[PDB]
Design a protein that fits this description.
The structure is cut from a larger assembly and holds seven copies of chain A (96 residues).
Chain A (H helix, E strand, L loop, with lengths): L1 E3 L4 E5 L22 E7 L3 E2 L5 E2 L8 E4 L6 E5 L2 E6 L4 E5 L2
Antiparallel strand pairs in A: 2-3, 2-8, 3-6, 4-5, 6-9, 7-8
């Protein structure tokens, strides 16, 4: 089990859409890596300058739309790929 | 349904003006993508250093003039293009 | 009608001086774009870190000497060009 | 009349020294533009984070040694050149 | 013995996996340096702007997934290699 | 007379050592410009966020070690060269 | 005698190990400059934004592992080389 520290989130990226809306199969770079993924673990919370810990608004098990960049990192836990990213890199959460 | 986090805003971009003011048809890069778009969703509000959350001055359903850049991000929801951008990237709002 | 957000100003750039001081007509790069323009709209005011919004020192209808750069954006409203710039980009205000 | 806002100063750059100490006339790039100039106008005062405005240490009519760069801007008022620069760009003042 | 100051951690990097999940031996760049390492020493703690020193959330003897970069540094203590990195450079500790 | 503003210091750079410790004459780039120089004038003091002015720890007439760079500026007063540099650019004072 | 101001430390770099663990002599770039050095002088202490001076955690006469970079500087006092570096550039002190 992996749990982050401060404003950091462990997110499992969802599989890229093999088929499009109309039923056509997408292959190669056309079926680009999905930017939404379910949240596996949430850190303790963002640290402020006054010394308090502010809990992250992201909950465990909620699909979130995030951004790939230098902030995000790829890690291998039990032969599975996870993304470690700051809560700021999380653009939004997905509900319903 | 998608809702943003903190200062981020979900905006649907308005369709680029195919027709100019004087009745001439605009095509190609000349009919550039509009910088105005109706706000689809407003985040909980920007977080300050003290720990309080201040609601964003933008409202859901208000057309806003925004800036394209690294901050804004393109996303697909229900087979439709939306932009995720920080409230700072929102230049202004359009009224009347 | 367009009004800005936080510390932003909508300014109407004045026409570039066609003629010089002594009556010489300037054309091309000689009649460079003017850096002074009348303020069309003033935002609510700059937001401080503590959460208080202080009104901008500029006023609607006052000519301001501004700086071109990444901060200023050229938007179009009713086939007319307006510069949206942060109040910091406003170097000075023109009185009398 | 032109006056600045916040921590900005309107300065009139002094004429470059045509002759050196020994009475030799200097021309071209050798007679470089002087970095000293009399202060024409002082802004209201530097903006602080807590919301207070602190008056600038410079005074109108005092010669100041300043630095050229991106901060300083050359504006024309009544066919005369004035430097608009932040108070930080002002290295020092000249007395006696 | 080596101990850090402020928000710095001394970590002993784990050996790179010679064999993969299926017993397939990996060599060269394929068996890249592991981003996990057991924590050897924890500094006194990060210093905030108010002047207080807070303890780090990382405990001595806990494996941490960290990021290699300019912040991390390699040091030779008792003919052994250790990485000195800021607590921010630590991504997530490993439990069970 | 010239005196600085806020966290700035006027220093007179010492003459570059012509002869080394062993009576060997050094010339050209080998006798590089000394980083040591006596303090000629001390500004009013650094300004903090809250609005108070804290006096600089350097004293007038005390030799200091300065780091050349963008911070330091070479001005001329009474045909003599003076370095205007921020107090942060001052490394260490020289006593005895 | 040389002493620093604010968060600065004067450190004498230790001699670079000529021989390795097994008694083999190392020469050239292989015997790289040591990153640990005994502390010769400690500044008054780091200054925070509120105006208080926080004493440095480094004590005089303690060997510290540091980082070479733009922050560190080389100075010649009594025909001897000393590194002037901010306490942030100090990585970790050495005990026993």
């Amino acid at each position: 089990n992996i749990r982050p520290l401060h404003d950091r989130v462990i997110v499992k990226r969802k599989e890229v859409e093999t088929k499009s809306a109309g039923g056509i199969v997408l292959t190669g770079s056309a079926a680009a890596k999905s930017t939404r993924g379910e949240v596996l673990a949430v850190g303790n919370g963002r640290i402020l300058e006054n010394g308090e810990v502010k809990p992250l608004d992201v909950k465990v098990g909620d699909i979130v739309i995030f951004n790939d960049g230098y902030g995000v990192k790829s890690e291998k836990i039990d032969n599975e790929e996870v993304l470690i990213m700051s809560e700021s890199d999380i653009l939004a959460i997905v509900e319903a």
